[PDB]
Amino acid sequence: QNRFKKETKTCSASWPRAPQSTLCATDRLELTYDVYTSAERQRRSRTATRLNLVFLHGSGMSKVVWEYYLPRLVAADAEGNYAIDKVLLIDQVNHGDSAVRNRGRLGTNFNWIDGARDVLKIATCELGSIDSHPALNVVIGHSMGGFQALACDVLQPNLFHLLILIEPVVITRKAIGAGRPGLPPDSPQIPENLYNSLRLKTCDHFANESEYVKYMRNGSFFTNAHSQILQNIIDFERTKGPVRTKMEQAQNLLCYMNMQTFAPFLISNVKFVRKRTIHIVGARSNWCPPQNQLFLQKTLQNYHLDVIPGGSHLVNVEAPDLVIERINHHIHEFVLTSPLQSSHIPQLTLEERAVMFDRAFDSFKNEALVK
Amino acid sequence: QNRFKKETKTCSASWPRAPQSTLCATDRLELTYDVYTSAERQRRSRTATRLNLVFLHGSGMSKVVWEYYLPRLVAADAEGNYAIDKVLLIDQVNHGDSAVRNRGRLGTNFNWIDGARDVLKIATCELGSIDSHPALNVVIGHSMGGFQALACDVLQPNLFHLLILIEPVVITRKAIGAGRPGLPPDSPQIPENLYNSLRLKTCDHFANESEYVKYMRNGSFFTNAHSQILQNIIDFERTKGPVRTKMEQAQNLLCYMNMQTFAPFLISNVKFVRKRTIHIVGARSNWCPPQNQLFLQKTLQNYHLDVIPGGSHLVNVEAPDLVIERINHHIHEFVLTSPLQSSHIPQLTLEERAVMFDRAFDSFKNEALVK
């Protein structure tokens, strides 16, 4: 990929966090993310909208699943006068390179809302320079990342203009079974059959390189991923003669075991998400129950569904070309209808600012005053 | 005051912000706050809880209204083994010293939730060192600051352990009148009679020093404040022969004109605030309608009301001794019943961390798995 300069950066994770996010209360987690910056900035006119994209991986994956997307994303468009300026590919604290940095620090409580706070900490930093203006920011999330896209807007509704959710996980199936007695209403839970079956597809450690690649291509969740994305997954996860993955099996499993302790907060707040939100689903997906999709449709005021024919829950890695075509379509249409868009850095004195404010205030007072 | 080392610090405000928070989209606001640090740290045992307090002023006031409180706050208690470590006194972007820093940058939209984000940015920074542990953090807010205390917990529920709300403003009276046609549901509004009367008590500029002090002592909102707090207000606000206050009249008025654009979000989320919350009201206060108080009582799971006999809406500045006695009482009782409280900085190797995690995970799996 030769379109964007790549830099890997590391910073501290958001703090504070849910109890038992770390092993010890004095531990502090870090985040590692890759920033991709356009090398096309000398082709931008003054009036050109900068598009910034932030991609949030699914449970048990990493930022690497989006690398295939980078050269295939929305070309700079002449008259619509926009271009991609930055793309951020983020690993949650217990995934990918962030997990490696956080070895020995992670606890049992991974709260996806804490992870949305991490996203905000990164993106508000990276997208916040007076340079990034006039900007339009887009968050694209798969699975957990889709939940987190929504939670980002809830917690900071002035950052993302467009949400693209690919198979978001919001409403899960409630376990029926028996089942620990005396628990508070919203206690962490997972059905045994789901745990066992996830355990068999989340292996972490292997005798050698041959057994590692054999498992990745035959026994992991990624066997049907686009061959280039699978190869990228294989190469990114490998750590070292036995082989261990960056993704820890326990951390992978914990992504499934704690939903009740944070999903109600998100569910209760989807009604505040006023942004255009694209919901991309795989037609063959039964990963989430019907109520998951229908809740989003009923609750998001500005909502569009795209169904990927043949797609599974992992449609982002198994049919990336179809997913990319949608993401490009929606970003293009969104920019075309987006309000202008002032791009001059104001050269105003304090006195000019005073006259302008007083005028703004008079206008606002006239609109607010109930006579 | 000789109890605490004082330092005034300035940082950037939270970003992004509601539209028209600033005059221009490229402006960036700052925050100024005072940090008070205990000089008693050599008297702390290893097991001593550090108490950190964060005080949030009301609309049209500033951080100065809490200075009188500093020497009168909860004494270090022997056997309850706690002491105040840090106290933060914060000026919102359009108040006090923050307003001075932000001269010419402020727009018409002051969204109190943005202001809660500012509080979090400051407090998470100041209270986040591995030093502050074992800590208990308390947020104390008057009026707007009370709203903001609640919003802090909503947006970051792992920071404050105890909320003390003094005359919080959450549910306001809806203006009946006529009244701008064609407006969205939740448009900013203020009744004309309220605006006019607030305008007469929010004067900003004065011919000279004599007219300034005459107005502060006879025509401002603070005429009945405790004489020391009034003197502190007078001295803190004075800027300079004509006199202008740090508090801008337009900014003061804007605190009252925009509630509909952010209060529903807070209202909808009070149900998530699980912390012990003390609600201190003035018995003679009619500033907020009945529904304001009753909503909080019905909605906060862990709630305690204290009624200050004779108190008005400005009970924090008019009867500070009564308010302080309550704040001390509640902090003391809260600490006494608060769970221990491990105070060693863990000296664990990666391998020890591995054994400990694996044990934690096994325990958690057994509690979560529905068999």
Curated annotation (Swiss-Prot), chains A, B:
Transmembrane segments: none annotated. Disulfide bonds: none annotated. Pfam families: Abhydrolase_6. It is an enzyme of class 3 (hydrolase). The keyword Transferase does not apply. GO terms for molecular function: triacylglycerol lipase activity. It is found in: Peroxisome matrix. Its EC number is 3.1.1.-. The keyword Cell wall biogenesis/degradation does not apply. One of its GO terms (cellular component) is peroxisomal matrix. Has acyl esterase, lipase and phospholipase A activity. This is Peroxisomal membrane protein LPX1. It comes from Saccharomyces cerevisiae (strain ATCC 204508 / S288c) (Baker's yeast). The gene is LPX1.
